[PDB]
């Protein structure tokens, strides 16, 4: 196979251009342009930089005596229709655009960024998530979830930012109303997991504290916002729970990425405690409870028909639910000047598990489809890659396990290779291409059916243990054989 290392330098993020297949890797003090085979095409230094979280960029040494040599782990790495988006942990989390194909050619870097252009989290231990979309006239847009960073000299958790503003010096800024207005950012401590787009809305998976609750505890939430809403009137928040909460902290999630369906409609979530667990939230069930929460807080003053409090205004904001007409949602589905906002369901979307892993703390999820069989790839805190079959049967079957690097957490940025024949797996210091179908290993029948993989089976026509698509002939499945040899 093939592996990528950087003399022990840590790898934060990974992104793939679906057009070229080129891989972009965001590391500490480094930016890497890698071929599909993990061959070095370019290197850019995010550099060790003399900085302090108590100073503002640009940093003139004379006005920052507290500065020490600071490392710049990558905080955000997204592929826009025309450029690479890069934000670092350093310099108040400012960003820059770079050419896809030659990351060394810088495209856009505001020369005097303002306090509105501090995009990413400036602490390398706080995570930043992002998403690139288009506005109503095609404008490139950056949606950013950013956790609470303390020393910073208060950036709202969710922000919509312009990538092609009229003035290229105002890039990475948000109109003062295209933000989520949270009061006590420190008492909600947002920890962001991922961000994805469904149709005309953006969604955010994150953990925050329920300040209205026992111990002000951390819960798992998903939130939705209309892509077009430049005022966040449409913002809703559902809490997510698996088995009531025996585990109860979403650590990673992904949708089924395959050749036939590129982005399915079920969100596979990994929870941890110690035992981990993998649950399914169908995304139409999320859109339902979100819509029910809107209708309740818009029309029935946050209460339901029986009168139970179902929805509520969220985050210290000074609004209340309303008795607006029943056709208000079907007339302002993304909100208005005077519709309740922001909103939260007091009723969680519960899921029962589909798989438990005892001594495993899951850190990464990725899902695809072979035939009609659904297959999950799961990374853990010990550098392991579990391959699991959920498919059209019942109760998941973990069928393989590998050790990418001992005791090194697996990165959630598990990406496929476009032909979905490989998976890119990273472990803090190592990035590896991984065959989804390790069939060739076994070259006789007893082997191909001993080592049991849903991808693999014995083509008797040829002399090979292979995928099905590699035979319209006679092929014996290794998982549910049905015959012998």
């Amino acid at each position, epitope marked *: 196979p093939a592996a990528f290392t950087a*003399n022990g330098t*840590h790898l934060q993020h990974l992104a793939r251009d679906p057009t070229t297949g080129t891989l972009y890797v965001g590391a*500490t003090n480094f930016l890497f342009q890698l071929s599909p085979g993990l061959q070095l095409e370019a290197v850019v230094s995010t550099g060790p930089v003399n900085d302090s979280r108590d100073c503002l960029p640009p940093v003139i040494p004379d006005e920052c005596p507290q500065a020490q040599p600071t490392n710049n782990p990558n905080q955000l790495l997204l592929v826009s229709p025309e450029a690479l988006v890069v934000c670092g942990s350093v310099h108040q989390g400012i960003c820059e655009l770079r050419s896809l194909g030659q990351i060394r050619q810088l495209l856009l870097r505001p020369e005097r960024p303002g306090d509105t252009q501090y995009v990413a989290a400036n602490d390398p231990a706080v995570s930043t998530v992002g998403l690139v979309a288009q506005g109503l006239v095609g404008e490139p847009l950056l949606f950013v979830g950013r956790g609470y960073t303390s020393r910073g000299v208060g950036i709202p958790p969710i922000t919509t930012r312009a990538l092609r503003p009229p003035d290229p010096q105002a890039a990475f800024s948000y109109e003062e109303t295209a933000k989520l207005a949270v009061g006590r950012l420190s008492e909600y401590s947002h920890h962001f997991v991922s961000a994805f787009v469904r149709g005309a809305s953006a969604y955010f998976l994150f953990l925050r504290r329920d300040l209205k609750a026992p111990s002000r505890a951390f819960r798992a939430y998903v939130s939705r916002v209309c892509l077009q809403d430049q005022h966040y009137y449409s913002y809703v928040e559902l809490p997510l729970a698996c088995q009531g909460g025996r585990y109860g902290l979403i650590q990673a999630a992904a949708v089924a990425t395959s050749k036939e369906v590129a982005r399915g409609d079920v969100l596979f979530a990994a929870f941890s405690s110690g035992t981990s667990v993998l649950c399914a939230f169908p995304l139409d069930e999320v859109d339902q409870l979100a819509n029910y929460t809107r209708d309740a807080c818009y029309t029935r003053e946050g209460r339901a028909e029986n009168g139970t409090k179902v929805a509520d205004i969220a985050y210290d904001v000074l609004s209340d639910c309303a008795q607006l007409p029943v056709d208000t949602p079907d007339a302002f589905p993304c909100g208005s000047d005077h519709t309740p906002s922001p909103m939260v369901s007091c009723v969680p979307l519960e899921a029962t598990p589909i798989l438990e892993l005892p001594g495993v703390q899951l850190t990464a999820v990725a899902v695809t489809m072979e035939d009609g069989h659904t297959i999950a790839f799961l990374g853990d805190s010990q550098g392991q890659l579990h391959r699991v079959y959920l498919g059209p049967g019942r109760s998941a079957a973990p069928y393989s396990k590998q050790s990418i690097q001992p005791g090194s957490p697996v990165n959630r940025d598990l990406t496929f290779d476009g032909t979905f024949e490989h998976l890119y797996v990273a472990t803090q210091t190592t990035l590896v291409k991984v065959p989804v179908a390790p069939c060739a290993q076994h070259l006789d029948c007893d082997s191909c059916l001993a080592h049991r993989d849903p991808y693999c089976g014995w083509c008797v026509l040829l002399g090979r243990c292979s995928r099905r698509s590699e035979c319209p002939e006679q092929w014996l499945w290794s998982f549910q054989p049905e015959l012998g040899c």
Partner: nanobody
Amino acid sequence: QVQLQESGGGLVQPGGSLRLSCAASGFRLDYYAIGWFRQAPGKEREGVLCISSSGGSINYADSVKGRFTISRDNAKNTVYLQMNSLKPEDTAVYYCGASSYNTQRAECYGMDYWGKGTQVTVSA
């Protein structure tokens, strides 16, 4: 809460020994390169000793050759600076930091995280 704690600093008699420790919390330092630094009053923060993620590479500052000793315990999430000999010019606040940069090496130029520091004072 990612944090680095320094312990063991205090007052000593020249020629004395002293063991400083650097406990990590909120993260495992198993794959980080750890470095000890110090800052005497008025002067710039210099580095004292550095160690790779594997412990296989250690690099010193010329002024402490054969006097100070670094060692790491990944399972304990702590790192120790054994300071023997001891000098009035050794008096400073000793900081401990971790880097995710070239961790298979003992360079320690840039740092990811820092400790609040513990003062070691040597009677003049």
